[PDB]
Amino acid sequence: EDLFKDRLLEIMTNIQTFCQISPMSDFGTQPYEQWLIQMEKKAARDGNRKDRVCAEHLKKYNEALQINDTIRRIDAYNHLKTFYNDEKEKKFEGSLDESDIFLMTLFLRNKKILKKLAENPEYENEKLTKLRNTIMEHFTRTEESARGIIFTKTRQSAYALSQWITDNKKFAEVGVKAHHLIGAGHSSEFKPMTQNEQREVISKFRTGKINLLIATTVAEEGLDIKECNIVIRYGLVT
């Protein structure tokens, strides 16, 4: 039905087989995510390296599943590619072991099919369609005073939503200038943005150089900008 999603699920199955785990929760669900989070913590405690790295990687795939489901296939593919590109960089050119080799080779085996599935032009899902029409209708209606914030759950989601806007010229043609806005603290899920960069982005939003901020919810403390005339909550409650 979704060949890209199906490949991801097959891969995650292989990894679970490799480290011999079988969680009650389903791939792509929050309780599955909370379960990986526990396993990973325990593996660091007990010092089980195989279990820790497998959980770490499984989380990257679970993340890709969620991006696939809520934004596009291409963004999910990029999330995985970037992660494996970083692993290759820091570990394959050492403290490299059987689990690292196994995970990396498993992804490389699938990379070109995943890439080509990602490159296939696909129709937007209903979530993104509803998001598009909301932005579009608001921007045409309020024109030069359009000033919006979209809240999303994760850093990778905010970045992906921003890329999608850029990839779609119709947004630009109704005035949209968007930018993601995320925290400074370290996260396994995504790179940080310094407090400095945050301040510059917000400044640009104040001046109107940016008019659509895409932020995580752990930003709302310093986003109380009176001139905002639309807020969109995108999948905060599922």
Binding site: T134, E220, N229, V231, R233, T238
Partner: protein, 52 residues
Amino acid sequence: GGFHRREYSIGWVGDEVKVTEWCNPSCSPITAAARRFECTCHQCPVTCSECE
């Protein structure tokens, strides 16, 4: 303060999407939580074109 800030909540079950929308006074706090606030600046209108 001074106007209506349009508020949206886009949620789903599977790929079945539901949108909730309403209005807040422009003086009220910006929040990820889905809140209905009252106007404290006293310059905000009672309704706009968007909420009738």
